[PDB]
């Protein structure tokens, strides 16, 4: 039913870069729901933001990634 894109577009990408930060709770599933993208590329984008200090890693496991906005 749902159509989750498997690649970033320009619009969904700057939405990830600008709107995903300042979310209080950030997970790949939440960002996938908001941006209508697959959880894999959502996780990749969140990892990219994490590398660049845009977001803060709160809880981490091999299968679970929880992020939050920077204070």
Partner 1 sequence: SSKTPKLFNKWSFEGLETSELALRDHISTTAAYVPHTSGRWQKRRFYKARMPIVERLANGLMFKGRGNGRKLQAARLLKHTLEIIHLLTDENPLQVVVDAVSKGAPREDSTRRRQAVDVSPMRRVNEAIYQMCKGAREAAFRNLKSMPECLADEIVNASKGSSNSYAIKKKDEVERVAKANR
Partner 2 sequence: SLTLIPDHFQHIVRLLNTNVEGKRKVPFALRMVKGVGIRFAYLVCKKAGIDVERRAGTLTAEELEKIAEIIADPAKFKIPDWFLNRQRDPKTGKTEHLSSSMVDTRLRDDLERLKKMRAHRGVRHAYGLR
Partner RNA sequence: AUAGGAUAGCAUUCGGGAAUUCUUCUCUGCGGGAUUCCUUUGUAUGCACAAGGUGAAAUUUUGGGCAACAGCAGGUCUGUGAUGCUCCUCAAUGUUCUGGGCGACACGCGCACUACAAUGUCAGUGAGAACAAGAACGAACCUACUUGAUCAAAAGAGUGGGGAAACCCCGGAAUCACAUAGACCCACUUGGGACCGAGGAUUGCAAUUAUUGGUCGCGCAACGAGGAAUGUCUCGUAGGCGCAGCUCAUCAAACUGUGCCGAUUACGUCCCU
Which of 7, 10, 11, 24 touches partner 1 by CB under 8 A?
Answer: 24
71 binds RNA (CB under 7 A): no
Q: How far is the CB of 36 from RNA (least distance, A)?
A: 9
Q: How far apart are CA 62 and CA 22, in angstroms?
A: 25
- Contact residues for partner 2, defined by CB under 8 A: 5-10, 13, 40-41, 44-45, 48
Largest distance between two CA atoms of the chain: 38
Identify what 68 binds: RNA, partner 2, partner 1, none; CB under 5 to 8 Å per kind: partner 1
For CA atoms 40, 14, 49, 36, the dihedral sign is negative
């Amino acid at each position: 039913a749902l159509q989750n894109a498997v690649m970033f577009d320009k619009e969904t990408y700057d939405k990830l870069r600008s709107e995903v930060p300042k979310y209080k709770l950030i997970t790949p599933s939440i960002i996938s729901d908001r941006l209508k993208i697959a959880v894999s590329i959502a996780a990749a984008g969140l990892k990219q933001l994490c590398r660049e200090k845009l977001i803060r890693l709160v809880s981490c496991s091999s299968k679970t990634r929880v992020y939050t906005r920077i204070v």
